């Protein structure tokens, strides 16, 4: 007749998830690029995207306090739960997730490795130095991320025990930021040359367009293919794997220039910039350390080390495979 309530409400919840994740990814990519353009190398031996993940965890620390259902799911208990896995969809898998650059972290580690085995992998000096720098960069990234998560949880407790200051006071600011993003995405993107005139204006347009699709792909991977095998969510892992191989392939396509003339082909400021925007948005919205950190030492007692090791090693082995 009119409708079907048990279906119309399910559709409304689904479209709410879609809108929230899209808006969160769009608003998080701009923060990522603000941090990246604010690299200002100075010290920070690694620098670049290093801070971004460190940011994404800390803010995520204020969500995991009230996340519960994810925490409960990674605790094999409480039969009458059946709750939404990514509660706070617009913040957990959205701003906190999209900002993370797991694929970019692995790419940075591999690039700083710079072909550890220069001519022979058996030699101690080159191999030891390469493995030392690779371990150092990976340890720095993940230790800083976990520390940021720890300070996030601690500060969440310290601010929660005093006064919540009404949660909806943050809901209103989130909504107004959503309207500002909508207005900007309308006017600035629509009023432009049809060839998407160059400069700083187009440098983010294609990345913004491609980011929410990667975020959606990761969200659906982390909802459908998740919790299929116990103690191994396998959703975030496959998302990160797909992201890192895709980024490696397209970086070889851009940076490698295997025919040699591919750089000459991308001399035109369209072919290289679409790949750059893809690197910015798609693989960056598909690979998340924030969800990775939550699956890490947040919970999943003991066995967490196995998941971390398998993920990191398989990703590195893949990106090595693209080298061949």
């Amino acid at each position, epitope marked *: 007749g009119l409708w079907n309530w048990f279906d119309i409400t*399910n559709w*409304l*919840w689904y479209i709410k998830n879609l809108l929230n994740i899209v808006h969160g990814a769009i608003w998080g990519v701009l923060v990522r690029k603000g941090l990246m353009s604010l690299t200002t190398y100075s010290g920070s031996f690694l620098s670049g995207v290093i801070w971004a993940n460190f940011a994404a965890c800390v803010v995520m620390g204020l969500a995991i306090d009230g996340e519960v259902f994810w925490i409960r799911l990674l605790e094999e208990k409480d039969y009458p739960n059946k709750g*939404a896995i990514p509660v706070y969809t617009g913040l957990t898998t959205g701003f906190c997730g999209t900002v993370s650059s797991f694929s970019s972290v692995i790419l940075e580690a591999f690039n700083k490795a710079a072909d550890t085995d220069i001519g022979v992998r058996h030699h101690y000096p080159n191999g030891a130095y390469g493995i030392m720098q690779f371990l150092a960069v990976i340890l720095a990234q993940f230790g800083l991320s976990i520390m940021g998560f720890h300070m996030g949880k601690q500060f969440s407790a310290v601010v929660d025990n005093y006064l919540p200051l009404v949660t909806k006071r943050i809901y209103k600011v989130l909504e107004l930021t959503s309207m500002i993003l909508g207005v900007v995405l309308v006017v600035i993107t629509c009023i432009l040359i049809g060839v998407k005139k160059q400069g700083s204006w187009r440098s983010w347009t294609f990345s913004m367009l491609f980011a929410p699709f990667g975020a959606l792909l990761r969200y659906y991977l982390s909802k459908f293919l998740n919790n299929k095998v116990s103690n191994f969510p396998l959703g975030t892992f496959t998302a990160n794997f797909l992201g890192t191989l895709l980024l490696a392939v397209f970086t070889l396509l851009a940076r490698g220039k295997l025919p040699g003339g591919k750089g000459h082909i991308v001399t035109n400021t369209i072919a290289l910039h679409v790949l750059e925007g893809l690197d910015d948005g798609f693989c960056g919205g598909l690979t998340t350390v924030s969800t990775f950190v939550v699956e890490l030492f947040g919970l999943k007692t003991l066995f967490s080390y196995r998941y971390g090791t398998i993920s990191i090693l398989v990703c590195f082995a893949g990106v090595v495979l693209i080298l061949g």
Partner: antibody, heavy 131, light 109 residues
């Protein structure tokens, strides 16, 4: 001026049967849900079940202590709500209320299929299942 | 006992007081509230986020946060003495509803 009046009380021997009717008028009845709520005397009231409309084909639901022992069906032509009981246990005693059900689901905060709120209630009927 | 409540609460006249509804399913579902005087039909009081039916005095305000659902009465009058019930989903996303164990409120006369 909406009103719901229950009828069909009286004592019932355990294991017997009883049919409860609810007269309702003054509001759209073919598109509004009905919910049976019972209250044992001196205790807290309990949920029995709800019956839907054309949205799902007049579906049913029941309480975990009631599932399989009660029956809820609706006759839209006569604008009345019917409740059927068989194999009545001693705990079924108390006041039976039939109350119209509202539907509520915020579009931004919530989880399907949302909450249910009763925009009105009825005077009530008394059943005493005593041996 | 899916929903738990305070069995009885006391408050003097013109002084505010709160009625606390605690449950697991309230995290992903809002609550409802029903004034119940003895021998009378319960009347809907407060439901959802900020929805209140027309006619009821403004003194009944409810808030939802965490795993608690709170209906706070401001200035309980002489006729406000009754039992108040909270109802919502039993399982977090199931096609059912349940009710609390009882909350008797007594205005100190």
């Amino acid at each position: 001026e909406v009103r719901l009046v229950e009828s069909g009380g009286g004592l019932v021997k355990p294991g017997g049967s009883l049919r409860l009717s609810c007269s309702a008028s003054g509001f759209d009845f073919d598109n509004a849900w009905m919910t049976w709520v019972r209250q044992p005397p001196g205790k807290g009231l309990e949920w029995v079940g709800r019956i839907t409309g054309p949205g799902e084909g007049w579906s049913v639901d029941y309480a975990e202590s009631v599932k399989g022992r009660f029956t809820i069906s609706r006759d839209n032509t006569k604008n009345t709500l019917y409740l059927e009981m068989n194999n009545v246990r001693t705990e079924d005693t108390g006041y039976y209320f039939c109350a119209r059900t509202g539907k509520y689901y915020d579009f931004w905060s919530g989880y399907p299929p949302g909450e249910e709120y009763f925009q009105d209630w009825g005077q009530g009927t008394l059943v005493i299942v005593s041996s | 006992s899916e929903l738990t409540q305070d069995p009885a609460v006391s408050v003097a006249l013109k002084q505010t007081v709160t009625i606390t509804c605690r449950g697991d399913s309230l995290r992903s579902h809002y609550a409802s509230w029903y004034q119940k005087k003895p021998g009378q039909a319960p009347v809907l009081l407060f439901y959802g986020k900020n929805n209140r039916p027309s006619g009821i005095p403004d003194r009944f305000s409810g808030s939802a946060s965490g795993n608690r659902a709170s209906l706070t009465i401001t200035g309980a009058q002489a006729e406000d003495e009754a039992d108040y019930y909270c109802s919502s989903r039993d399982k977090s996303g199931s096609r059912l509803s349940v009710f609390g164990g009882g909350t008797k409120l007594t205005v100190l006369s």
